[PDB]
Write a protein that binds this ligand. Sequence first.
Ligand SMILES: N[C@@H](CCC(=O)N[C@@H](CS)C(=O)NCC(=O)O)C(=O)O
Ligand SMILES: [Cl-]
Ligand SMILES: [Cl-]
Ligand SMILES: [Cl-]
Ligand SMILES: [Cl-]
Ligand SMILES: [Cl-]
Length: 140
Amino acid sequence: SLATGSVAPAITGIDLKGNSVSLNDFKGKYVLVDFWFAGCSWCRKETPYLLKTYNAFKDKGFTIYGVSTDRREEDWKKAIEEDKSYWNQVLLQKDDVKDVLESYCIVGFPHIILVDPEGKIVAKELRGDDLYNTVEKFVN
Ligand SMILES: N[C@@H](CCC(=O)N[C@@H](CS)C(=O)NCC(=O)O)C(=O)O
Ligand SMILES: [Cl-]
Ligand SMILES: [Cl-]
Ligand SMILES: [Cl-]
Ligand SMILES: [Cl-]
Ligand SMILES: [Cl-]
């Protein structure tokens, strides 16, 4: 991971509507960035916490930006349907996966961080109830 206070590096992927959507698109909002893939069990198990958080704060200048490294688009879509994880979900193009992971120095998954409205990383290692409580702290 990167140090808190770091500027979050650029990310672009393709969303479920077939459009390119970047982290920069959410400037002005707090954004939980969730790096994951379908075969990451613990990533999937965070879903209820992510949904609870998304629902509580989505009207107050907050969103979730999910970023998958799935090699297969089918696996990614199946997971989203199974999890009902219908926030902003993008899939990295193959040629971008290594660059994104290196830029965020991602070693392990899940990797869930909180980015502020100016694009600075303000929290990391977010899991479970701590995820909700951390977002509450920054958004409220
Ligand atoms: N601007 C940083 C970006 C690279 C970076 O942050 N690397 C990771 C390790 S791959 C790091 O040192 N992270 C510190 C942390 O996560 O606290 C640098 O060049 O050192
Ligand atoms: Cl930085
Ligand atoms: Cl970006
Ligand atoms: Cl989407
Ligand atoms: Cl990491
Ligand atoms: Cl993390």
